[PDB]
Amino acid sequence: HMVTIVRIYLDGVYGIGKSTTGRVMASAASGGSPTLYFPEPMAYWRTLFETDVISGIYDTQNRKQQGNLAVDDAALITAHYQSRFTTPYLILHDHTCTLFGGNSLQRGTQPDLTLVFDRHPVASTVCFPAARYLLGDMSMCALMAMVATLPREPQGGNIVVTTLNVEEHIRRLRTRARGEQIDITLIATLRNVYFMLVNTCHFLRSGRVWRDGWGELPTSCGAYKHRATQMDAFQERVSPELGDTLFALFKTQELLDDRGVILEVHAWALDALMLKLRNLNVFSADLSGTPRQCAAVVESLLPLMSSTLSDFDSASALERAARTFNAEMGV
Amino acid sequence: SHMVTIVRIYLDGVYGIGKSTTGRVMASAASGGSPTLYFPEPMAYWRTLFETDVISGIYDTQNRKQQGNLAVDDAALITAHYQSRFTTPYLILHDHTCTLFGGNSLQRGTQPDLTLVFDRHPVASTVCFPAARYLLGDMSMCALMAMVATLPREPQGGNIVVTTLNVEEHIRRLRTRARIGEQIDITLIATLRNVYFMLVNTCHFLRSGRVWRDGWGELPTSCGAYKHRATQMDAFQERVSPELGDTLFALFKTQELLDDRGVILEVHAWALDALMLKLRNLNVFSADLSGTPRQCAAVVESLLPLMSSTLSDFDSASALERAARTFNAEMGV
Ligand SMILES: Cc1cn([C@H]2C[C@H](O)[C@@H](COP(=O)(O)OP(=O)(O)OP(=O)(O)OP(=O)(O)OP(=O)(O)OC[C@H]3O[C@@H](n4cnc5c(N)ncnc54)[C@H](O)[C@@H]3O)O2)c(=O)[nH]c1=O
Ligand SMILES: Cc1cn([C@H]2C[C@H](O)[C@@H](COP(=O)(O)OP(=O)(O)OP(=O)(O)OP(=O)(O)OP(=O)(O)OC[C@H]3O[C@@H](n4cnc5c(N)ncnc54)[C@H](O)[C@@H]3O)O2)c(=O)[nH]c1=O
């Protein structure tokens, strides 16, 4: 008994609908075949240790403004809690990775098993870090630090970057939290970072590498940074330029030598990013309709996705991992 | 298509023991053996390549701790951030060289076509130093987990040699560099020494073919006492037949990671699994450096019969030679 598994990482900017979405896809209410959902590791972040890292992050963007903590220092304290967000993702990823199996193909069929992970390690190792850096809240050096910890995606992974029109995105961000300030720049920049990420996988699928069109590309400075904070600045592109992708932000003096050439060690890092994101078959989804509709939109690009071949012990082991994960990541 | 036999060695252990000097000799042709490339410590990355020198910073933040001007709360957060900054260049190097070692790792008891000495394995900055900072109360168990998790998986064929030294001689050396009213910081040194014994014992335990679970639920729930004892000099040693108590696993049995029943949470057992898996491709050895640089170089060398080799190709071997040349340039001073 071999099993055909398809794994989906649902990802994108927060407050868009994605968690409702996967949670619906998982629930017995959608039909199709067995669908297991791995939720966000909330408990890990909030209750399992003395410090609640979400409550800590913003607590520091407050302090840094409230004229009470060195601006230099909140860039370190925040860098740190950004690190803490990654941990449970890396643990999950380590545990699940042996079990997905091999023989990744686009089979066209329905799989015996469907997994939906709420977010891929890329979100908290590259994307959120990249955004905090563009906002000046975190240094290049520190972005490097985090990007370096992204694990290699094994074969057959599928990442669906969820999207939404801005209007509606603001409506759903008020319905959830008010009192506290929403942070419209973080949202604007994250929207851009996620487009950049999507562009990046399309870039790689098109067979290019980060060196291609690197010389031509302009150095990326205050001007380029600020632009990533503006809304709509970037968008999905099936044939992107280098500058439409995540690599563009790494061309800065910080990483360049006396004559404008990127250091070999830094090229190595850009190399590793490109390696790690390569087994990630990229898709988009607009989360405009109702949770049930959103679900069927994700479920509709199932025939396009990458399936693996697993043995019946591991299937079982993933389902156990599913049960446990939902259980302990509780609240 | 031409087949090259590589053996890689990670020299590791407590700082100030002689390891970097040893490695430079193993590289030097005068020490015979097989051609040796030596990847040094990523100094430049840490100190010069960015606006902040992680070595200055770190201690400058332990200083503002005792010396009122910055919170005790923040120190264990800025210090952790800096500990994380130490690991970056090692992860980068690891990612660059890993896909070049090739496979077929088989302890072949002969001299290899070539030898790579890396100064330190990712384990040093993602497990060992973090573990010691936690045992000293400078860092939380949760911060620890945030770093333990970022150990990369060692591929087949990795050999790690934990360097050792009697305490007299080790201290002597420490004062030999340093110089002029600089404090040493025995406290850390003592804990790091214990952590590295825990590590040699850990991989033994694991090669033995034991898992972290064997003997777990009968092991004393480690907390207050255990932390003191980890910081006490020579509390730990290289055990011949190590048990769970002697290993790095012991320190993760704390209230912080159990439920109301005294049972480790499953997500925590997973983190424990990961670490056990990565620590399974490292062939572990210990080497003593009381001899002279040459003697030391020979002590590590004589082990080679015991070490494991991978088969790479000529074009890969030749990129390692560049890799080593590049790393050496970009990291000096
Ligand atoms: C990963 C990461 C996160 N964070 C920070 C950023 C955030 O401030 C915070 C929590 O981030 P979270 O992702 O853990 O949890 P949420 O804040 O809940 O954001 P989500 O990731 O869950 O976004 P979703 O949009 O997937 O969440 P969801 O709850 O589905 O959507 C929010 C609201 O929209 C409505 N909704 C959902 N679907 C809807 C639909 N189809 N129609 C109408 N409304 C819909 C629901 O009523 C819900 O109230 O953590 C970091 O700082 N660094 C990091 O690396
Ligand atoms: C990796 C890491 C480092 N740090 C911090 C802790 C430390 O304070 C600092 C040093 O970082 P480093 O280890 O790159 O720099 P060093 O302090 O130089 O330590 P080494 O790695 O070089 O240790 P070694 O023992 O290899 O250094 P070495 O210079 O070889 O030895 C010290 C002295 O002993 C003499 N010596 C060497 N071999 C000798 C021999 N055989 N006989 C007699 N003397 C010998 C040498 O002349 C030298 O002066 O960085 C962290 O906080 N966290 C981390 O994760």
Side-chain angles (χ1 to χ4, degrees), chain B residues 16-21 41 46 83 125 129 173 177 291-293:
Chain B
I17 262 174
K19 128 183 101 18
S20 284
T21 260
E41 297 277 48
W46 286 338
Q83 186 47 66
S125 51
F129 276 68
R173 313 222 163 134
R177 15 151 284 212
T292 68

Side-chain angles (χ1 to χ4, degrees), chain A residues 26-70 72-170 172-174 177 179 181-238 240-305:
Chain A
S27 116
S30 344
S33 300
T35 289
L36 287 167
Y37 173 71
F38 292 87
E40 245 160 18
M42 209 55 57
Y44 215 109
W45 287 331
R46 327 196 77 216
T47 66
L48 293 191
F49 300 111
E50 200 112 8
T51 289
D52 166 28
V53 330
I54 300 155
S55 147
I57 270 253
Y58 293 106
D59 159 290
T60 288
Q61 249 62 219
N62 297 324
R63 277 153 68 133
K64 143 183 166 230
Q65 244 152 314
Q66 245 151 305
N68 218 31
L69 181 74
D72 296 333
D73 263 12
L76 313 202
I77 311 253
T78 292
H80 176 95
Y81 287 115
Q82 189 46 66
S83 253
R84 282 209 196 195
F85 271 97
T86 313
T87 313
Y89 287 115
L90 287 198
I91 293 164
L92 184 45
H93 196 264
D94 279 2
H95 170 79
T96 68
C97 267
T98 27
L99 329 171
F100 302 128
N103 316 276
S104 146
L105 257 231
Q106 292 162 118
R107 251 149 223 124
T109 52
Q110 271 265 328
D112 316 291
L113 201 53
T114 300
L115 307 193
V116 177
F117 297 82
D118 208 305
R119 279 204 185 290
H120 177 277
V122 72
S124 63
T125 40
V126 182
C127 286
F128 267 78
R132 304 221 174 254
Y133 155 79
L134 286 162
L135 300 174
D137 303 332
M138 190 210 269
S139 86
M140 193 8 92
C141 185
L143 179 67
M144 291 291 267
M146 319 230 31
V147 178
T149 64
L150 199 221
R152 200 204 40 115
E153 186 63 42
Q155 67 190 295
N158 293 275
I159 172 159
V160 173
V161 173
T162 69
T163 54
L164 189 47
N165 59 92
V166 28
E167 202 219 289
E168 177 55 25
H169 187 194
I170 300 138
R172 297 171 175 183
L173 251 156
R174 303 242 229 67
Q181 281 123 56
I182 282 298
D183 205 333
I184 344 244
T185 317
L186 197 71
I187 274 111
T189 299
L190 269 192
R191 290 182 61 94
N192 281 314
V193 178
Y194 271 96
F195 277 130
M196 286 191 204
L197 159 64
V198 169
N199 284 345
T200 300
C201 302
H202 285 325
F203 186 75
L204 303 181
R205 184 59 250 257
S206 114
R208 284 180 282 151
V209 298
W210 70 261
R211 283 167 166 309
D212 292 334
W214 174 275
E216 266 170 2
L217 195 80
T219 306
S220 288
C221 321
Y224 163 92
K225 286 164 139 281
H226 183 74
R227 205 183 141 273
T229 71
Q230 342 240 58
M231 118 209 184
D232 249 88
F234 284 85
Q235 82 192 44
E236 190 165 358
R237 280 263 165 76
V238 181
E241 287 172 57
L242 180 62
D244 291 309
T245 68
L246 277 185
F247 304 112
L249 65 93
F250 291 102
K251 223 225 182 152
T252 347
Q253 292 142 223
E254 291 108 296
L255 305 168
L256 313 165
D257 66 8
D258 329 307
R259 349 121 49 88
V261 214
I262 196 172
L263 288 178
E264 266 299 296
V265 72
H266 298 328
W268 291 352
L270 278 196
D271 278 327
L273 183 58
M274 164 172 82
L275 206 89
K276 279 157 199 214
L277 301 157
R278 188 187 285 300
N279 284 315
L280 268 193
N281 189 177
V282 73
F283 301 95
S284 84
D286 153 279
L287 293 178
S288 273
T290 26
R292 191 72 72 84
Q293 303 197 297
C294 283
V297 166
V298 175
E299 297 257 352
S300 77
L301 15 120
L302 256 157
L304 275 355
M305 281 174 168

Side-chain angles (χ1 to χ4, degrees), chain B residues 209-217 219-251:
Chain B
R210 293 177 132 267
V211 310
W212 68 261
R213 289 183 187 273
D214 305 319
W216 169 274
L219 157 104
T221 281
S222 295
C223 28
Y226 178 97
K227 292 178 102 206
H228 284 311
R229 105 165 273 201
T231 63
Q232 117 178 280
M233 188 76 83
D234 310 314
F236 286 75
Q237 51 182 97
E238 180 164 16
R239 255 63 207 300
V240 163
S241 298
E243 305 191 289
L244 192 54
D246 290 299
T247 70
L248 279 168
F249 297 108
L251 70 79

Side-chain angles (χ1 to χ4, degrees), chain B residues 13-22 41-43 46 55 58 83 86-87 90 119-120 124-126 129-130 133 169-170 173-174 176-177 188 192 289-294 296:
Chain B
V14 213
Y15 67 87
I17 262 174
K19 128 183 101 18
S20 284
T21 260
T22 303
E41 297 277 48
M43 215 45 122
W46 286 338
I55 276 148
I58 187 144
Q83 186 47 66
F86 277 113
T87 103
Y90 296 109
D119 197 310
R120 287 190 187 296
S125 51
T126 69
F129 276 68
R133 294 218 152 289
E169 189 36 25
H170 187 169
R173 313 222 163 134
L174 264 155
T176 302
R177 15 151 284 212
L188 177 64
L192 268 160
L289 323 179
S290 56
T292 68
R294 213 212 82 242
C296 289

